[PDB]
């Protein structure tokens, strides 16, 4: 609705599910990927990507 | 120029998070922590400095359920780091997986919304 602002954003938010990354029960990267994404979130690296990729237009 | 406030009670999440992330303003307001939270609100009302870096949930509940909803919070709940709350357990306790299963199930079955609407719901939350 931000790019082709023809529709509206009626309704509220519910069933708020934080997007995760699931793996099989055996994987040697689960802890590593968890700590890496935690570090990226803490340093705000994802926010820059949000600014430079999606939240960049308005009408 | 004006004397501002960084009131953070000791033995809490706010002071530890501030000193872990940005250990610069803590030293400036080291001798500024209020005794509790009721006296903290009293000092907030009794104008000497209008600032409190506290928990988002507690502050939101207080603002929603305030006497006339006079004092407010800066921003639309822009939490510094949304970490939430946790449930304690013993090291290696045999119940953690079941605890998580029950918690996620009750997250699913639309009841903690009822709990929040019963306890932490404000009076000015809908009011603008």
Curated annotation (Swiss-Prot), chain A:
Disulfide cross-links: 5-59
Glycosylation sites noted in the Swiss-Prot or TrEMBL record: 32
Record note on modification: NMDA is probably regulated by C-terminal phosphorylation of an isoform of GRIN1 by PKC. Its phosphorylated state is influenced by the formation of the NMDAR-PPP2CB complex and the NMDAR channel activity.
Subcellular location: Cell membrane; Postsynaptic cell membrane; Postsynaptic density membrane; Synaptic cell membrane
Disease listed for this protein: Neurodevelopmental disorder with or without hyperkinetic movements and seizures, autosomal dominant: An autosomal dominant neurodevelopmental disorder characterized by severe intellectual disability and developmental delay, absent speech, muscular hypotonia, dyskinesia, and hyperkinetic movements. Cortical blindness, cerebral atrophy, and seizures are present in some patients.
Similarity field: Belongs to the glutamate-gated ion channel (TC 1.A.10.1) family. NR1/GRIN1 subfamily.
Function: Component of N-methyl-D-aspartate (NMDA) receptors (NMDARs) that function as heterotetrameric, ligand-gated cation channels with high calcium permeability and voltage-dependent block by Mg(2+). NMDARs participate in synaptic plasticity for learning and memory formation by contributing to the long-term potentiation (LTP). Channel activation requires binding of the neurotransmitter L-glutamate to the GluN2 subunit, glycine or D-serine binding to the GluN1 subunit, plus membrane depolarization to eliminate channel inhibition by Mg(2+).
Domain notes: A hydrophobic region that gives rise to the prediction of a transmembrane span does not cross the membrane, but is part of a discontinuously helical region that dips into the membrane and is probably part of the pore and of the selectivity filter. The extracellular N-terminal domain (NTD) is a site of allosteric regulation to modulate overall receptor function.
Subunit structure: Heterotetramer; the NMDAR subunits are modular and harbor tiered domains that function in concert to regulate opening and closing of the cation-selective ion channel pore. Forms heterotetrameric channels composed of two GluN1/zeta subunits (GRIN1), and two identical GluN2/epsilon subunits (GRIN2A, GRIN2B, GRIN2C or GRIN2D) or GluN3 subunits (GRIN3A or GRIN3B) (in vitro). Can also form heterotetrameric channels that contain at least two GluN1 subunits and at least two different GluN2 subunits (or a combination of one GluN2 and one GluN3 subunits) (in vitro).
Protein name, per record: Glutamate receptor ionotropic, NMDA 1
Species name: Homo sapiens
């Amino acid at each position: 609705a931000s790019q082709k602002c023809d529709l509206v954003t009626t309704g509220e938010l519910f069933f708020r599910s934080g997007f995760g990354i699931g793996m099989r029960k055996d994987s040697p990267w689960k802890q590593n990927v968890s700590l890496s994404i935690l570090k990226s979130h803490e340093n705000g690296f994802m926010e820059d990507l949000d600014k430079t990729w999606v939240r960049y237009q308005e009408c | 120029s004006p004397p501002f406030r960084f009131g953070t009670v000791p033995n809490g999440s706010t002071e530890r998070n501030i000193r872990n992330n940005y250990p610069y303003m803590h030293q400036y307001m080291t001798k500024f922590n209020q005794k509790g939270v009721e006296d903290a609100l009293v000092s907030l009302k009794t104008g000497k400095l209008d600032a409190f870096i506290y928990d988002a949930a507690v502050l939101n509940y207080k603002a929603g359920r305030d006497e006339g909803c006079k004092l407010v919070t800066i921003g639309s709940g822009y939490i510094f780091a949304t970490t939430g709350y946790g449930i304690a357990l013993q090291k290696g306790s045999p119940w953690k997986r079941q605890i998580d299963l029950a918690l996620l199930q009750f997250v699913g079955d639309g009841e903690m919304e009822e709990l929040e609407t019963l306890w932490l719901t404000g009076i000015c939350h809908n009011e603008k």
